[PDB]
Design a protein around this ligand. Structure first.
Ligand SMILES: O=C(COc1ccccc1P(=O)(O)O)NCC(F)(F)c1cccc(F)c1
Ligand SMILES: O=C(COc1ccccc1P(=O)(O)O)NCC(F)(F)c1cccc(F)c1
Ligand SMILES: [Mg+2]
Ligand SMILES: [Mg+2]
Ligand SMILES: [Mg+2]
Ligand SMILES: [Mg+2]
Ligand SMILES: [Mg+2]
Ligand SMILES: [Mg+2]
Lengths: 236, 18, 236, 18
């Protein structure tokens, strides 16, 4: 692509600069460039990858939600419908969101999941796979929707299996995965009981083995634990 | 941290509401 | 362009939707589409135009400033310079900023300034001309810089002449123009005395004829008056 | 309004400082 001639170390550096300037589109493009060099990502680089695309798609999702809400105060017919304009723009945002999701899932399949080594690394990418399928599911319909939901679930479940075998119960990747998988249960798979069950199990097992989080990431761990308890507060 | 938490709450509540 | 087949009324509508979703790039593109239909903009439409591009270029400026500041904590030599990466990315942002400025100035010249009627409308576009030249000046150098500074000043000054002849001293376009022209004096033309002079004159004349602001825009007026006093606080 | 004012102050101060 456009990043082919630039050194891998320069791409990482510029992604960090883009993060500082909150240019998440550029950040993503620099990290896509780095991933395409064909070498493993370290812990720090994987996080830069995730931060970039989560923020790109998060923006598209928030716009999608604004348009959807507007659209559904004035879809309820009988009153004024302004014509196709709201639907048209929402569909535009959707297509763009679909594009970015398709990109991340392509990098993951070609080839982050392939050439991972760490149990940590396999889980991190399988969790990402789950997430970007989940984002596709939020706006998809019909047969495409069912394909996507089973793809997300298949990725999440394999990530969880490995994580339960290979990672302490306070590991932040383990925790972040369970958090997001429980969100999938609630918001995508129409299984709120299984969402609550997972979130509570995850929190309680974290507490029971609190002695296991590490000097490097305990701050990440405690925040996700708090996020789990907040969702539980909301969902019960 | 509390900003992160509040944003999370708003996003998750959105789904419940709409 | 890409907006050629879409109805003018649909473009305006979608710009308003883009504003709500904070998609200022799309907002700008919709308004560029509307402007290209070749009809005058109303008061409301001119403001949508301004909001879109001010926010697009404001984003680029903030990124430029972040990169510039980073660059100038680690340009002061003797220590580590990481190579060309910070300059390279800053130059990229600059080029993009220059592009958007060149677009706005093109619309204004082809053809918003041409076919204006209102004294209000002529002032509004000549003020915009001043602003987008000012943004170019912040990052320009050499002979190009001097050309740009004289272009901004020429636009600002003509806007002021008309405004003093045609608009009450509390008119928000009049006030916003003087505010920005005083900022130009301070930040671009290296004339801080002339900046302070203008800002104080503008505020005092507004107060002396306070009875003139209108039921439609007094909220806009009072805010710019407060902005004038804040800059004065900063500059003295 | 006060948000608008604070942002303006930060932007203008940036130039003075740097
Ligand atoms: O605040 C939210 C709301 O939802 C999102 C918003 C933007 C992007 C992605 C999401 P999501 O649907 O994947 O959760 N989520 C929590 C978090 F930001 F992802 C998160 C997870 C783990 C640790 C954190 F410190 C933060
Ligand atoms: O807050 C600022 C800082 O500077 C900017 C930031 C982004 C875009 C453009 C500018 P500027 O250099 O043109 O002022 N400016 C004041 C204002 F936002 F433009 C403004 C003017 C009149 C009335 C307002 F309610 C607000
Ligand atoms: Mg090489
Ligand atoms: Mg669609
Ligand atoms: Mg188990
Ligand atoms: Mg026509
Ligand atoms: Mg340049
Ligand atoms: Mg005079």
């Amino acid at each position: 692509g456009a990043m082919g001639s630039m050194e891998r170390a320069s791409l990482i550096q510029k992604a960090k600069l883009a993060e500082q300037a909150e240019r998440y589109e550029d950040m993503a493009a620099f990290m896509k460039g780095a991933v395409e060099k064909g070498e493993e990502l370290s812990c720090e680089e994987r996080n830069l990858l995730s931060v970039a695309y989560k923020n790109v798609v998060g923006g598209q999702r928030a716009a999608w939600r604004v348009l959807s809400s507007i659209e559904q105060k004035s879809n309820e017919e009988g009153s004024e419908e302004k014509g196709p304009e709201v639907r048209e723009y929402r569909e535009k945002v959707e297509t763009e969101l679909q594009g970015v999701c398709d990109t991340v899932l392509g990098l993951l399949d070609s080839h982050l999941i392939k050439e991972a080594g760490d149990a940590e690394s396999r889980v991190f990418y399988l969790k990402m796979k789950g997430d970007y399928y989940r984002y596709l599911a939020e706006v998809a319909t019909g047969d495409d929707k069912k394909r996507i939901i089973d793809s997300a679930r298949s990725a999440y479940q394999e990530a969880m299996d490995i994580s339960k075998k290979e990672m302490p119960p306070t590991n932040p990747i383990r925790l972040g995965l369970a958090l997001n998988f429980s969100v999938f249960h609630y918001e995508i798979a129409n299984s709120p009981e299984e969402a609550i069950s997972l979130a509570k199990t995850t929190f309680d097992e974290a507490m029971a083995d609190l002695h296991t989080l590490s000097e490097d990431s305990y701050k990440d761990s405690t925040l996700i634990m708090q996020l789990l308890r907040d969702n539980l507060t909301l969902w019960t | 941290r509390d900003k992160i938490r509040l944003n999370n709450a708003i996003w998750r509540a959105w789904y419940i509401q709409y």
